[PDB]
Amino acid sequence: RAACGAVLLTELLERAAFYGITSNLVLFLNGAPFCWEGAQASEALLLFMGLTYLGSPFGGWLADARLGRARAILLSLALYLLGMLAATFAGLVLVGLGVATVKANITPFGADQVKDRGPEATRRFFNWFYWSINLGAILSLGGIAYIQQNVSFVTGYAIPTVCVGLAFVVFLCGQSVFITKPPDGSAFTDMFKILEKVEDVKALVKIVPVFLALIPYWTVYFQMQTTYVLQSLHLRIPAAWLTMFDAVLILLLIPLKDKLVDPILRRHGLLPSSLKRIAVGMFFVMCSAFAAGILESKRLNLVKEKTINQTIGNVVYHAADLSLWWQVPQYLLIGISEIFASIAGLEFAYSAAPKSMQSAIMGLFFFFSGVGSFVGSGLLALVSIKAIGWMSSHTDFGNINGCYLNYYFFLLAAIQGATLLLFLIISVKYDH
Template sequence: ACAAILLAETFERIAFYGITANLVLFLNRGDFLWTSYNAANALFIFMGLSYLMCVFGGWLADTILGRFRTIVISFVVYILGIMFLPMLGHDGMRGKLCGGRAWIIQPINATKDTTDNQEQYCDSLIYPIIAVIAIGTGSVKANIAPFGADQVKDEGPEVMRMFFNWFYWSINAGVLLSLGAVAFIQQNMGFFYGFLIPAVSLGVALILFVLGQPAYVCRSPSGSVLTNVFRIIMEACRSRRRRRRNYSQPRLVDPLPNPTWLDMAKVRYGGSFHESNVEDVKSLGKILPVFIVLIPYWMVYFQMQTTFQLQGLHMRIPPLNITMPAAWLTLFDALLLLILIPVMDRVVYPWMDRRGCHFSVLKRISLGMFFGFCAVMCAGGLETYRLQLVQNHTITQNISGTSFYAADLWIWWQIPQYSLIGASEVFASVAGLEFAYAAAPRSMHSIIMGLFFFTSGIGSLLGSGLLALVKKFNWVTDADHGNINKGHLDYYFFVLGGLQFLSFVVFNIVAVSFHRAKMKRQKQ
């Protein structure tokens, strides 16, 4: 059962990263000629919706369908969306789906006024496609890990930990295969084959998952915790006036000396909810501030496959017999994860524990946020130098049939920022998942995991919003189809760095408050 789930997850990740690895290039190149801003914005929206849909997928499984049926239906929706991408990558099919261009390509010396009003070719089809894919992948993401955990739930914590270790390994195996092979095919053989492989991979994932059905432990939907949370909050709001009443009726339990507004939903105050249910909602209120302060980190994290890639497309790529995909730089993030996670888990953390130096989850998240700040500041510094260099040392590169005017600066200079993002993920992302599971009440593990992914989706969408805001200052322009050489992407990176540093400071304040509250509860 677990083998089928792990293999399905690997093939699903191949499909997902096969979409995201080069989506910016796909839309920015000659077939579509979207501006750099709109191409990056499309990926921000796709990533954001994918993570936002995790909450919807978890609710659907818990309340109506159960996890197995939700995963199968989500895979089908996922496939229905992804099957359009190879068609968009095929010269003959693209015209039938999108029709003729709505505007004529302007010459290289076109002014900003002549390019501002150009519509993005086929956007009325592309945005619905990525929305459908996002619904599918978000619902799969929300349920496949908990469904796998259901299979080993009764076999003890050691087996459970082993499953999650292999699950995370399966994710990264899919990432490496997708970024290493699929991204290469997209840039060297074309996007028809480059998107056909993810579509086939997703079909294989569905088949493998369904084949394991006879061995699965399938649990019936037990009602949504999210629904109960809203009911408790609504009842507490309606019942706040009860605090001022004189309770003359006999009660089995004495009221609390200083009840909060949420306590008004408890049975002892005339509400209809058990004590433990309300306390779980109060715990959620203590965890959410940590998630919210992490949002700027996610804004930085999602630059890796958007603005970082745009920057790489405008730098010198090695003159090999093949075109090295700009997305290959993301491999430094994945490889660093594969190396650092076992080293930290097996060597560093045990060594620190033996010496009484406990590296708490919140400290790890804080360190990860600092690495994220360093990554985006590196990107900003590199972009400042690249913009200075491109004025006098410009080279022309043909990438996937499109000419890019690049600075005479090797793309390898991006390795530090990608590596720092990888280091940040080892601490902030992995520790964030651990915090989401460890700090959550037992009845709310699924919903809090969903909210963790939900806030990362908000981070992606806010990254898109910030890009739209700086566009008004011409830091990202529409001139020459969004040529970043005519903007100031470095200013965008520095603003992100400022937001990340501010959130780093606020996070440490929130973490201290959370730690003190936890110690106070333990003493009580």
């Protein structure tokens, strides 16, 4: 239909711009634009990310009553372009709000273009949606690297600006064929305060427990991502490309997963719902945490005998004799888990959402994921205390050797176990 293609393309540019912003924010804010403190840039980026996570439910509400699911995205992209065409705190707030609204509004609108075909069509569209997001991240990183290398640094913001602008142009061009739904609502507040609209309230209350189950999984996922990024510099490597291993792996795996799982699972006749797929993803996170803990424990045991100097980046991280390739099973497990879990959870959040406020539900889901990321950061901060020990190295970039991480990984695995059991209980209660 090419409408899903245009939606995917717009998501590609939006994700590319957002990932470029997140990667290069602190480097740009190193001190040239009157922010000359590492903590001041760190809190600026943290505030930007927190507002991005917080504004998604509000972006969904704005697309519930005032505007539809197309005018809202167009206005969000206009705000995006204005922000990248811009004291700076107001601009950062504008950019964060635009990102939140566009992220919370594209996905349900994208699934709406194909919903009539069938539930399997929605699953295929969401698979390709996540694939497009990851390809956008990879392309953004490669493009900014190529531009900063071949061309001078004067065009640093140029790539995000052209990405956002091109997204606006393709969205405007596609609007002529896109399928749109008129907005309605603002008549549900009195329904859940007394204790089709009644069944809507029942669906709304039944949705929440699965999100309360999913949030600690989000904390574990974000903490695991950060710890893997921080660990890969301490293994013998034969800038910031170490955070794209998962992206490359899932980019290579998603088409293979589709063509080599869905036809056979459909053929076998035992194709499960989304909750089972989320449970499988959490089980693979379990296995990933166990494998990472084992690998890091062996690396620390080898470090205790001798160390090897490394000079990756501007820091002088001291590495071990283990090659970086030894982390391939870890990232393979985490990629399989991501494919089986994130896509399934997104599909369930879209499908089980009320037929009239899908955008609000998806925004709430994204806000819950962000709150989980914050909870995981708080857990990392709590663990670093001297009363319990474990991680005891922050400095400017840290030195993990001589500091415990195996117990941290196994704590992550145990938290994942508790969450998996609790989510299994809620899934049984939901589908029974």
